Amino acid sequence: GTFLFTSESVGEGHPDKICDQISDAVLDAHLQQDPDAKVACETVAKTGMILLAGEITSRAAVDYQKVVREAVKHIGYDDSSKGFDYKTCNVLVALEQQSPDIAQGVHLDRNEEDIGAGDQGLMFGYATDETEECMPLTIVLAHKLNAKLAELRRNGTLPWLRPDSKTQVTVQYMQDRGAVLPIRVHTIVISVQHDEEVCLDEMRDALKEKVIKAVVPAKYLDEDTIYHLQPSGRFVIGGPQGDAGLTGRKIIVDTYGGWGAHGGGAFSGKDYTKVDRSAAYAARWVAKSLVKGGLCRRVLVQVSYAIGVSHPLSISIFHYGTSQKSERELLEIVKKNFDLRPGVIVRDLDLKKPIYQRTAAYGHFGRDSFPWEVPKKLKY
Amino acid sequence: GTFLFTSESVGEGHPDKICDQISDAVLDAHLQQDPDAKVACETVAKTGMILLAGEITSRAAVDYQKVVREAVKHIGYDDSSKGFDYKTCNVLVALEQQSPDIAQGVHLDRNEEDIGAGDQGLMFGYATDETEECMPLTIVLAHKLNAKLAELRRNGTLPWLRPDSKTQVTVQYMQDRGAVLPIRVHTIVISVQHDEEVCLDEMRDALKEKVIKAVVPAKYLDEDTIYHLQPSGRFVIGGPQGDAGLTGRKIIVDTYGGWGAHGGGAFSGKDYTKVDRSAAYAARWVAKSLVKGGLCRRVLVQVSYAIGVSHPLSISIFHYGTSQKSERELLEIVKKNFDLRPGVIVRDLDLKKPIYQRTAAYGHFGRDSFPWEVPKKLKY
Ligand SMILES: C[S@@+](CC[C@H](N)C(=O)[O-])C[C@H]1O[C@@H](n2cnc3c(N)ncnc32)[C@H](O)[C@@H]1O
Ligand SMILES: C[S@@+](CC[C@H](N)C(=O)[O-])C[C@H]1O[C@@H](n2cnc3c(N)ncnc32)[C@H](O)[C@@H]1O
Ligand SMILES: CCOc1nc(N(C)C)nc(=O)[nH]1
Ligand SMILES: CCOc1nc(N(C)C)nc(=O)[nH]1
């Protein structure tokens, strides 16, 4: 009954992730002044460039040059030696108002509770009892390895580290009546951008001793665990100079690491009317409520919408055989306890609050007790 | 045992899809001259602009202005009245060589069969016996509805149609020992860009009579089927003018429509060394071979890689309880029949051939008998 499963994560300076963080810095800057801002901000990053493209209709007065540069500074790209510098990069803006055809069909003259979905689409929520935070261990460990790299870079322990990193964790699991039980870590990959001076052996030793051992419990590591540390051999060129980044290109890192499913929508740079974000957060909230409520050990929830229509078109539950209740019964419990109209989700999850840049690295789920991470007490 | 499941698809003129098609037109233009081109071409589209950003190392001489404009012409954006025009749009290029640090770690001085994966990552393949092509009915129908719109636009039946469209199909299924059986179509959404002259009732009638009835079998449609046709009410502004598009933002439309799983990687604009594409195609090939080989009714396959390492780090099989054989036994069959090194996949799936622009709309799977759609005869 054993099997392997792999998930990855990336650091704050991974170019796709830079884009997600900038998109959400822009969203938060708008929401700080106009809680009802309509934002659809895409970011593109390549050598020396941040380009903002999309549609924003807002009463806020936002200084895009300042917001973008401050986000890049926070990430740690502050010198041409690192391949990117917030002080001297090009910031280009191609932002227009939201299409009036979309606005009239979604929200104009609509009661907030009855606002229409901002687009059609499908979204999934997932939760698993394998960790207290109800997330897959593979992705939790992968995120923590990138967070550890950023911690050691920022406190000056490993000053040769640069912001761009990727990690990947393969866990060997046992199947248990549809639930999954982590046994051991089979393989770890770490690739991180570095300075010109540090040698490969010094990096590999530090990645094992100061990063992996500082994150992964020893009980999961053994003589057979495979380590791929700086497997490319050299990673001096990094960030946007090494690879063009775009918003919404790390949607699996943002969610469940391959577990569960995804509807395709990106989160960053979007206000609550874009159900790609708000309904995915609500679906996570439902899934976690079902697991913490003791109704199943793991569960997948799907929801879908049509543009301009408030109520979801469909809701579905897949419990992997981990409940005594049928999926039909769980769906009835969900329908009695949740209202997944976007105009209700916004109230329940406080989605006009400018906390979005905090979600844009290290995953949107399983951290920091955001509203979608606080289970709802279910009545049935 | 009944449940609902929803999938979406988009048309050739959806702005994200325009980007995927342009990225793959660029890839094919390079491969026509240099079969070993290293391509990582991202495209961004917004009002009046196509921007190419990324990394290409190739011996080809490619006229980016001509390649981009020809792709936009094919899609049908040929007049400012449509919101976008290949003849007069801005084409901007920010393309540099592939990072030498990546090149040295992946492919330089390597025997082709032993080339390293171009990046780390995870990829999934899926197949289901619910259709002959081994794809979920939800996504097959959603794709065919967009293809029908483009057919009626191009033959002049519905001259008010414009290239940008989205569709969404919800099917009611029955569960059958882990397999899924389509019963009926519960809800259909169609949104399509249109001219200023046509009225809503004429469009809704045409979408039902000339589009849905021309695609979806009557046996699936009944008095209860819900139709959301032009639900926003007005969609004159469309294409990149209505919404910024980016390459790799329709990864679920490109694959399984919410069924199965996704590793996060985009396909378009990437040569075979980028396992996000080649290993996902090979995983589809494995999954379809297992279903057509009669070993399971539906199956999910995961593979993963480390940058610079040829052999996958992990391979896993989830058969949803639809095989008499254990997942351990199916994994042994896969390991005896397939070699998922990128330098072998390229040979088996002929991945230096310039057929990629053909994959960039209507899904990469379940169509046209591409090599990954031709099952391998399994020996065990
Ligand atoms: C390998 S690059 C993607 C392929 C690239 N676009 C190309 O031109 O081949 C993807 C990510 O891997 C990381 N990366 C960049 N250079 C790397 C290197 N030399 N070694 C390992 N990882 C690298 C960065 O996080 C980057 O965003
Ligand atoms: C609704 S837009 C996404 C949200 C948008 N960025 C905004 O500013 O609100 C997403 C896709 O829906 C389609 N779309 C654009 N305008 C539309 C309209 N008026 N009615 C329906 N669908 C529309 C296009 O395919 C577009 O790429
Ligand atoms: C949340 C709905 O997703 C799924 N449901 C099911 N069943 C069998 C109900 N199978 C899947 O593969 N996905
Ligand atoms: C292909 C590996 O994906 C999965 N495997 C399993 N099991 C139980 C083997 N459960 C999942 O949710 N996904």
From Swiss-Prot, chains A, B:
GO biological process terms on file: cellular response to leukemia inhibitory factor; cellular response to methionine; one-carbon metabolic process; positive regulation of TORC1 signaling; protein heterooligomerization; protein hexamerization; S-adenosylmethionine biosynthetic process
Family of the protein in this entry: Belongs to the AdoMet synthase family.
Protein encoded by which gene: MAT2A
Function field: Catalyzes the formation of S-adenosylmethionine from methionine and ATP. The reaction comprises two steps that are both catalyzed by the same enzyme: formation of S-adenosylmethionine (AdoMet) and triphosphate, and subsequent hydrolysis of the triphosphate.
Residue numbers carrying Phosphoserine: S99, S369
PROSITE patterns tied to this protein: ADOMET_SYNTHASE_1, ADOMET_SYNTHASE_2
Binding-site residues for ATP, renumbered to this chain: H14, D164, S165, K166, S232, G233, R234, F235, D243, R249, K250, A266, K270, D276
Ubl conjugation as UniProt keyword: yes
Subunit annotation: Heterotrimer; composed of a catalytic MAT2A homodimer that binds one regulatory MAT2B chain. Heterohexamer; composed of a central, catalytic MAT2A homotetramer flanked on either side by a regulatory MAT2B chain.
Residues involved in L-methionine binding: E55, Q98, D243, K274
Tissue specificity comment: Detected in kidney.
Name by which UniProt lists this protein: S-adenosylmethionine synthase isoform type-2
Keyword Ubl conjugation in record: yes
Highest taxon listed in the record's lineage: Eukaryota
Signal peptide positions on this chain: none
Cofactor: Mg(2+); K(+)
Enzyme class name: transferase
Pathway stated in the Swiss-Prot or TrEMBL entry: Amino-acid biosynthesis; S-adenosyl-L-methionine biosynthesis; S-adenosyl-L-methionine from L-methionine: step 1/1
